[model samples]
Target: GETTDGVYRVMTRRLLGSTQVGVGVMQEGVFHTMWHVTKGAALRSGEGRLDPYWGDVKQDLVSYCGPWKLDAAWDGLSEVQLLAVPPGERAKNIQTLPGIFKTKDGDIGAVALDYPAGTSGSPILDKCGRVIGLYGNGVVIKNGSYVSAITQGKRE
Candidate 1:
């Protein structure tokens, strides 16, 4: 059974290059889902061509033309796990559960989570009063616009 009631904080670290990117902690015991759109372009050339001529250069680009989703579980304070669900199983079986949280910076949105509400289950709170879903897929964000911008070598 669970016996704690309060907001927990979660943190995330992402490395765009050599820098460590992190998100601030927010309230606990809620579920959040976020979406991101990514875009990018690449130059393609014919086989065996070390340097393709301007007329031979080809550009390829894509968007959120497919399906993508991230799932996470947090104990209201600390982060748990951030996982990318396979495209095959995203919309149907995925139901909106409780303990989700959402935050954003400009155009970027992030979803968070907290310990699920119940009793006789796992330890929802830690001795220090920190929510315990930190290992249960606590954060997930879509990968498209932002990801492509950097990976494609585009400067902010």
Candidate 2:
């Protein structure tokens, strides 16, 4: 894989002298991370090898996490995995599936996962390393973790 086809660690300033571990990835020439990870925070001052402007929140799937059910078409995805690079760890992976969770934002799609901590900006990928979605947040129920769907763009 090229240097660009991978996830990156993200850093940002939060309120009340707080700090958070963030993650990001480049998809279809665009860099994406969770909006909550950068909301009301400065990305330019963050860490890692990423260009501050590359992380775009306007492209974020949804503003908040909720029960998002994937559309029937998502059943086509197989052997999917969640990839993340948190503090001290180069990367991590978790097997998951689609159509298991639903977003509160109506029918907006999301992937079902076990939801790991400190991986808010991870990327969901198919067996071929094709990005399926961007990991967002999750709920308490088992297999309730989710990443909003990203089925637009190139599909070859």
Candidate 3:
């Protein structure tokens, strides 16, 4: 009963015994994106979820590791702003700013940044409340894409 398979089977049995029971036993591998604008919020709120494991697993794993470093370049063409900083610097900076707003001619699409501990940053907005560029490490536009997802350590 204390064995791995036994424990797993017991958990499954309890889950299946829930109010909503199915006829057949369906087994699936739930791959969650450890990376998100928010920690586990996406998964809890159902904002982001990848099924069949066809998304970026490496990025998700990075998120789980620590504050991920989005590898991208933000040229002078794009403006940069510091929305949130670490706890020590919160008194001197602003955190939890509004999301980014891009212009019609702006090519900004995705964004990357070095999110540090206790600090989260996004993009800036104009007087009219339009996003220009996400105030992270980098942003993707037009044909932007993410790198491959990394696998996490085996369940132990």
Candidate 4:
């Protein structure tokens, strides 16, 4: 729970009995930020998955209405270099990079633009590596904390 650098969170999913995932501390960009999970995601408690690079932390969650899809094909991120942008500048473009790897500023490094408040899924890092949290519509739930055994819509 120290630094936020060299940390990456990936978001993969299992839709309609299908599965997907690849490799690394790989974190997917363009997942979620400061929103709650969509209704169904909440119902299933299955939003997406997050994998950390430094410590191997992980998470799944629960997003939005009137939503939009990401690029059909995209690249996964094993490492994210955050930004030098200040809070005042953060609003400009969290989507300023390839992986959409935007995050709030920190002494460690620049990456996931922001996190809610807690050990939950706020792009926070623990073990200087092992820490995770889920992203949903409105809430951020820290992964491995409650550790949901259920793997519905998982990145199987």
Structural similarity to truth (TM-score) of each candidate: 0.15, 0.56, 0.24, 0.19
lDDT of 3 by residue, 1-156 (tens): 111110010011233352211000011233222233233432211343322322233333212222322233333243333333333332132222233336585533333333442232232323333323223333344566321111122222
| Ranked by TM-score, top first | 2, 3, 4, 1
User: How does candidate 3 fare on TM-score?
Assistant: 0.24
Residue lDDT tens for model 4, 17-36: 42222101213332322222
Q: Which model is ahead, 2 or 3, in terms of TM-score?
A: 2
The list of candidate 2 runs beyond 4 A from truth reads: 1-3, 13-20, 40-42, 45-77, 102-117, 142-156
Top-TM-score structure, candidate number = 2
C-alpha lDDT (0 to 100) for residue 69 of candidate 4: 19
1 against 4, candidate with superior TM-score: 4
Better of 1 and 3 by lDDT: 3
Which pairs of residues have clashing backbones in candidate 2? 67-102, 67-103, 68-101, 68-102, 68-103, 69-101, 69-102
Quality of model 3 by C-alpha lDDT: 0.27
Stretches of candidate 4 off by over 4 Å are: 1-26, 34-121, 134-154
Q: After superposition, how far is residue 24 of candidate 2 from its true place, in Å?
A: 0.8
